[PDB]
Amino acid sequence: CQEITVPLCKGIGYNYTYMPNQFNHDTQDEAGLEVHQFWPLVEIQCSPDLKFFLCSMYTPICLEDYKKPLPPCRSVCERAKAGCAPLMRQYGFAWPDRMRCDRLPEQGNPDTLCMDAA
Amino acid sequence: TGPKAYLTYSASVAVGAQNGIEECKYQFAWERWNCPESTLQLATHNGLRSATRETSFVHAISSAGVMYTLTRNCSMGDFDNCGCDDSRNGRIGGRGWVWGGCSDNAEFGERISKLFVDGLETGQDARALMNLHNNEAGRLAVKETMKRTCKCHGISGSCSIQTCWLQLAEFRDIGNHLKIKHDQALKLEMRGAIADAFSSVAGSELIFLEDSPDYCLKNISLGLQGTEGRECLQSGKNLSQWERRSCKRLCTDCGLRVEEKKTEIISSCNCKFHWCCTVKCEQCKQVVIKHFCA
Ligand SMILES: *[C@@H]1O[C@H](CO)[C@@H](O[C@@H]2O[C@H](CO)[C@@H](O[C@@H]3O[C@H](CO)[C@@H](O)[C@H](O[C@H]4O[C@H](CO)[C@@H](O)[C@H](O)[C@@H]4O)[C@@H]3O)[C@H](O)[C@H]2NC(C)=O)[C@H](O)[C@H]1NC(C)=O
Ligand SMILES: *[C@@H]1O[C@H](CO[C@@H]2O[C@@H](C)[C@@H](O)[C@@H](O)[C@@H]2O)[C@@H](O[C@@H]2O[C@H](CO)[C@@H](O[C@@H]3O[C@H](CO)[C@@H](O)[C@H](O)[C@@H]3O)[C@H](O)[C@H]2NC(C)=O)[C@H](O)[C@H]1NC(C)=O
Ligand SMILES: *[C@@H]1O[C@H](CO)[C@@H](O[C@@H]2O[C@H](CO)[C@@H](O)[C@H](O)[C@H]2NC(C)=O)[C@H](O)[C@H]1NC(C)=O
Numbered sequence: 001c002q003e004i005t006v007p008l009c010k011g012i013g014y015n016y017t018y019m020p021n022q023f024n025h026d027t028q029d030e031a032g033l034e035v036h037q038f039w040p041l042v043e044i045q046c047s048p049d050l051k052f053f054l055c056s057m058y059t060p061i062c063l064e065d066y067k068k069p070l071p072p073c074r075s076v077c078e079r080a081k082a083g084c085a086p087l088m089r090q091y092g093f094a095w096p097d098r099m100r101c102d103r104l105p106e107q108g109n110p111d112t113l114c115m116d117a118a
Numbered sequence: 119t120g121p122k123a124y125l126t127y128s129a130s131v132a133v134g135a136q137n138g139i140e141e142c143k144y145q146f147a148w149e150r151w152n153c154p155e156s157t158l159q160l161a162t163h164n165g166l167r168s169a170t171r172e173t174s175f176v177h178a179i180s181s182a183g184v185m186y187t188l189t190r191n192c193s194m195g196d197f198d199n200c201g202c203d204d205s206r207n208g209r210i211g212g213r214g215w216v217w218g219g220c221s222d223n224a225e226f227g228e229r230i231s232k233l234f235v236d237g238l239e240t241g242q243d244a245r246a247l248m249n250l251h252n253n254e255a256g257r258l259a260v261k262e263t264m265k266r267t268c269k270c271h272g273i274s275g276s277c278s279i280q281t282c283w284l285q286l287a288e289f290r291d292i293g294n295h296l297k298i299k300h301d302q303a304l305k306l307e308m309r310g311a312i313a314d315a316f317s318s319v320a321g322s323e324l325i326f327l328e329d330s331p332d333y334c335l336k337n338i339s340l341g342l343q344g345t346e347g348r349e350c351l352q353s354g355k356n357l358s359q360w361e362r363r364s365c366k367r368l369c370t371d372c373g374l375r376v377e378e379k380k381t382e383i384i385s386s387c388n389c390k391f392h393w394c395c396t397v398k399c400e401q402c403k404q405v406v407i408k409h410f411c412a
């Protein structure tokens with residue numbers, strides 16, 4: 001584990017993330033340069049979940065008791081896509097293929113453990 | 119090749135050869151010969167003076183282990199002397215991608231691996247050429263398996279533009295590969311008349327001379343401990359038809375009987391995830407029943 005240094009992801013729920021991430025990034029700074037390109041959509045608040053979602057992917061949680069990766073649930077992603085994609089579509093921006101939601105576990109499985117709302 | 123160099127790499131090399139032995143142990147986990155080999159043994163040559171098919175695999179996978187580990191040693195910040203493959207960096211390798219990153223220095227790993235592993239192959243005899251061959255067979259297995267890995271640094275992460283470098287495959291995949299190379303190795307019948315016959319053999323393929331002993335049987339002269347007292351697999355949800363046969367293969371076909379052994383183990387389980395930040399996993403006592411030859 002190391003501590004979150006990227007601005008957009010500070011105080012989202014946890015202060016500790018690991019590297020490399022699901023996107024295969026060396027430093028948080030390298031990861032930050034890319035997630036910062038979403039800064040508009042965060043301010044627009046097209047989805048409340050987007051900041052949490054983008055941060056669970058670019059700086060996934062790191063726990064000292066649970067050493068298996070912990071991704072966001074499919075439902076969390078499907079809501080951020082629901083809010084953001086139309087607006088992004090309007091400006092010629094496709095919903096990123098890494099952000100795809102079927103690549104994520106659905107909630108309600110002991111085998112597929114994830115992060116979501118009830 | 120001076121004792122100052124031999125010492126600076128020796129720690130890492132020993133770790134490497136062990137990885138090779140451990141993977142060999144993995145690949146043959148449920149076979150009659152189960153890699154009863156030590157790291158030490160490939161220096162002592164005790165437990166493998168038998169130019170059998172299986173001795174070929176040991177040479178390759180351990181040579182492959184030394185090279186793999188030190189190539190990765192080099193690439194990470196472990197040796198000051200070697201950087202990585204800076205050659206070809208910066209260039210344009212294809213449509214919408216460029217070279218860069220830290221491509222693994224395989225030629226460095228091969229360099230060291232030859233120094234230690236091929237060193238132990240003392241003698242100018244036919245067996246020593248055989249073993250020398252098998253070393254490179256595993257060594258070049260490590261090289262060929264290298265693949266272009268990439269990171270997409272386009273707009274918003276799009277793979278439109280990307281930086282690539284040349285990376286090692288997972289050592290497992292090298293083990294699986296060399297396992298195959300072992301399964302289809304071939305026997306040789308044979309001073310320069312011998313050295314001719316070895317050059318008629320592809321550098322990738324494994325060479326062996328003697329036929330392999332009955333591995334059901336104990337033969338302390340060969341370092342073979344017999345199949346008795348070995349765990350086998352009976353029941354399993356997702357076991358290879360191979361794995362399901364392990365009990366008949368290791369035990370009954372060898373004359374021995376199949377006994378069960380009740381083991382209780384403690385495993386973290388039944389995990390529930392609290393909202394945000396935390397996950398709390400209670401631990402459970404679980405009963406696993408193992409099987410073995412008696
Ligand atoms: C070349 O690369 C190889 C790996 O490819 C590398 O082998 C590994 O080296 C590390 C560093 O010595 C070993 O890591 C140790 O693992 C043991 C358990 O056996 C730990 O106890 C060690 O912990 C130390 O550090 C901790 C944090 O500071 C402390 O809490 C602890 O008290 C110890 O001080 C340590 O993590 C690893 O075991 C080997 N791999 C093996 C042997 O399989 C090799 O060292 C590299 N060579 C160079 C030049 O670095
Ligand atoms: C432990 O292992 C030794 C050696 O095993 C031999 O070499 C192995 C690598 C494998 O190729 C084995 O298939 C092979 O047997 C065993 O000793 C060997 O015993 C056999 C007889 O059972 C001998 O075979 C003879 O060879 C002669 C010529 O010298 C013939 O005339 C005979 O017809 C017969 O075929 C063989 O020479 C012998 N090897 C030596 C030199 O020791 C041994 O059987 C085994 N021990 C145990 C505990 O089982
Ligand atoms: C992560 O660190 C931050 C900042 O230290 C914590 O947020 C609060 O920090 C203030 C001091 O700046 C403390 O007085 C509060 O106790 C913190 N708030 C809370 C939630 O109690 C935050 O708590 C840390 N997160 C974790 C993982 O505990």
Ligand SMILES: [Zn+2]
Nearest residue numbers: 160238239249
């Ligand atoms: Zn040898």
Ligand SMILES: [Zn+2]
Nearest residue numbers: 291294295296
């Ligand atoms: Zn292969």
Ligand SMILES: [Zn+2]
Nearest residue numbers: 352353378409
């Ligand atoms: Zn049973």
